[PDB]
């Protein structure tokens, strides 16, 4: 209680001591990226209902897309050919992940179940490999580390590392107090950051099971979270219509990306291969490209007729896919 | 077509996938999705558990009762921003839980994601409410003082065998939920109050007619006739 608030103000004053300058002051001399005019190069039509999630495969050619009609469609972006179409038991799916190997694809939602689907079977049909069922809330995000390990965030305020083979939660993460909405695995796949509705973002250790650091600053639910390519910074997106880049080592927010005109929350956030650009999808039926270092809106990807639910940048950084409640997905480039 | 033999076969696979998707699209359009909100003891399950399907006049309706998630509900209500209606069941008998239900209705009615979605309120257990009024027990004025000042409206349609006391009680609850719905929203969405009971099995027909009116009103703006 008293010790608790003492420790709290202690942490606060430490961060302040480390706040010698600002990212803005530092990059004041860095030349702006300039206007980033990106045009829709492909439009993947075929989903019947609102697209709620998407994930690029490591090959940067295939991507899975979830919809409220209960269908996960794998698309060959290069040729706009639907590779596979998986019917899902629960129509209400809020998340979809693509395995780094490409052998599996997992989805989850208000079913409170994370179903892993083996894409490459001898029978030639996509079949549900395992149905993880421990979580007690809607699963909001699921990201694969192995073809045998997957971290899933849930509205039960808890995240969990699972062993696909056994079907048991190897590790649970119960630090958050509000519905965890997003999770982002570090490039090194040793740490994962999760943003929740408690306006808090906690960095976790996947093998120790403990919350290493806790970052605050958003005034509302952190709807989206993403990791900077170096694995030393993470950017967040909240209903506060603000995006904030927190540095892991400094333990302190570096820059905030807000514009007076923007009054709609961020649904999805993502960085470029270099991390210079922070592409975030707002509820204004469009996505804004923000120069991360200079905190200036470089460009706008406006081609959607509904809330841009998901945004993903290819691993090769060649293209940016954007899924919307308009049942369409556009590969901007 | 500058496509290899394997490319052509992949395009063919995509076309067959597209065909099954089209048949699926037809079923999706025909099915009208409904969201069964409501608290416990409301008997939400017995009006007609995560999902329930029923068909009236060759029109199939899918009713989704999401009771697995509690506490903050706005986060998962974003998913049901396309349902044709939100069946909301209220236990008229319990007045202690009534104020909570009013708060829930207010939240649902004002939810930014449900600002164009209509609500078919089904005051349930109207029988139990009557028994409480007949026996007196807890006065409704105790829970809501306005009940004394309240009088049965002229527009009210008294059912046969309804003591004016029982009648005033029923329309008092309806008045509260109407008051809640009239304050917010601007003709974008409407509330359809239907006094219902446990034995009452005509509930499915009420849903049907109310759904017709809602879709008619939307088609009247979609075809630009308004």
């Amino acid at each position, epitope marked *: 209680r008293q010790e608790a608030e003492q420790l709290k103000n202690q942490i606060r004053d430490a961060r302040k001591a480390c706040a010698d300058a600002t990212l803005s002051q530092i990059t004041n001399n860095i030349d702006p990226v300039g206007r980033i005019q990106m045009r829709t190069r492909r439009t993947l039509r075929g989903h019947l209902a609102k697209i709620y999630a998407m994930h690029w495969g490591t090959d940067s*050619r*295939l991507l899975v897309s979830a919809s409220q009609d209960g269908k996960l469609i794998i698309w*060959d972006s290069y*040729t706009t*050919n639907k*590779v*596979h179409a998986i019917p899902l038991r629960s129509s209400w799916v809020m998340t979809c992940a693509y395995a780094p190997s*490409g052998n599996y694809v997992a989805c989850g939602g208000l079913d409170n179940i994370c179903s892993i689907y083996n894409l490459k079977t*001898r*029978e*030639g*049909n996509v079949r549900v490999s395992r149905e993880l069922a421990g979580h007690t809330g809607y699963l909001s995000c699921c990201r694969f580390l192995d073809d045998n390990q997957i971290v899933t965030s849930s509205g039960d305020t808890t995240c969990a590392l699972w062993d696909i083979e056994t079907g048991q939660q190897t590790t649970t993460f119960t630090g958050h107090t509000g519905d965890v909405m997003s999770l982002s695995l570090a490039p090194d796949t040793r740490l994962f950051v999760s943003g929740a509705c408690d306006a808090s973002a906690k960095l976790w250790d996947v093998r120790e099971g403990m919350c290493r650091q806790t970052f605050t600053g958003h005034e509302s639910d952190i709807n989206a979270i993403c990791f900077f390519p170096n694995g030393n910074a993470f950017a967040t997106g909240s209903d506060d219509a603000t995006c904030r880049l927190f540095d892991l080592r400094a333990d302190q927010e570096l820059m905030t990306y807000s514009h007076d005109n923007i009054i709609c929350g961020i649904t999805s956030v993502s960085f470029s291969k270099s991390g210079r650009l922070l592409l975030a999808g707002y509820d204004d039926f469009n996505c804004n490209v923000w120069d991360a270092l200079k905190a200036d809106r470089a460009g706008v990807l406006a081609g959607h007729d509904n809330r841009v639910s998901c945004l993903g940048v290819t691993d090769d950084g060649m293209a940016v896919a954007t899924g919307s409640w308009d049942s369409f997905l556009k590969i901007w480039n | 077509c*500058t496509l*290899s*033999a*394997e*490319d*052509k*076969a*992949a395009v*063919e*696979r995509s076309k*067959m996938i597209e065909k099954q998707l089209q048949k699926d699209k037809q079923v999706y359009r025909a099915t009208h999705r409904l969201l069964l909100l409501g608290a416990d003891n409301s008997g939400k399950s017995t009006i007609v558990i995560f999902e329930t399907k029923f068909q009236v006049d060759k029109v199939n309706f899918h009713m989704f009762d999401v009771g697995g998630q509690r506490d903050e509900r706005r986060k998962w209500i974003q998913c049901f921003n396309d349902v044709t209606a939100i069946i909301f069941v209220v236990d008229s008998s319990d007045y202690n839980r009534l104020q909570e239900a009013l708060n829930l209705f207010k939240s649902i009615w004002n939810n930014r994601w449900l600002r164009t979605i209509s609500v078919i309120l089904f005051l349930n257990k109207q029988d139990l409410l009557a028994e409480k009024v007949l026996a007196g027990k807890s006065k409704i004025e105790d829970y809501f003082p306005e009940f004394a000042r309240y009088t049965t409206p002229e527009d009210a349609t008294p059912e046969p065998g309804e003591d004016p006391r029982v009648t005033r009680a029923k329309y008092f609850i309806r008045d509260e939920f109407l008051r809640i719905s009239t304050a917010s929203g601007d003709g974008r969405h409407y509330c359809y109050p239907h006094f219902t009971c446990a034995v009452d099995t005509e509930n499915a027909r009420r849903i049907f007619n109310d759904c017709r009116d809602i879709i008619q009103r939307m088609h009247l703006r979609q075809y630009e006739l308004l």
Partner: single-chain antibody
Amino acid sequence: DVQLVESGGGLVQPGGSRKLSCSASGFAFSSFGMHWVRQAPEKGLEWVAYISSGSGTIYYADTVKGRFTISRDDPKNTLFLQMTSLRSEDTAMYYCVRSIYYYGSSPFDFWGQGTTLTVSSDIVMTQATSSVPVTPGESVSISCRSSKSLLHSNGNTYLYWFLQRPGQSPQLLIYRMSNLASGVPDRFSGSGSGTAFTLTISRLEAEDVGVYYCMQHLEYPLTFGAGTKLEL
């Protein structure tokens, strides 16, 4: 388990007609486009017919064009080949092959056992060495040349390698020039230049004895190579 048992073969007087039937079990027959490939008693493989998923695109070979017809009964999981005007040149064992086509697929993966029928412009695949003697533990390099570069603009070289172990149906070893097939030891490696290709089998074992065929999938008719035998 995936099985493709075909039946309906036997002695037929010239000019007769017979229907070959391949019963499928253990896979989604509907999703897999099927092919019929025959092997003359002493010669190599020759693509006969191909029916796509959903009985859409049905290509045939010039030799059997018109005389033969391939049909698929998706509900009954069966592939049929009604052959008419059976000439003495149609005496061969017919194999039903499954082939699914999607980005990253392994076409021609499973071959059926085979049924024997005894009758009383296209790219040329040239396997120069008919035979190559080799002892176990050594490394071989079966070569196959092509009339046209099999490298399509899509960047995929469509050259497939198959192994027919004595008394056994062919088995896909390398698909699309380099991609190794599932269940195949890593000792097999595929190299290609667009026109000339080479299958390197390192640390040869006893299992690797058999004939090796190079098939092109750039365009139909699909053309198999004469075959290079590896004798112990």
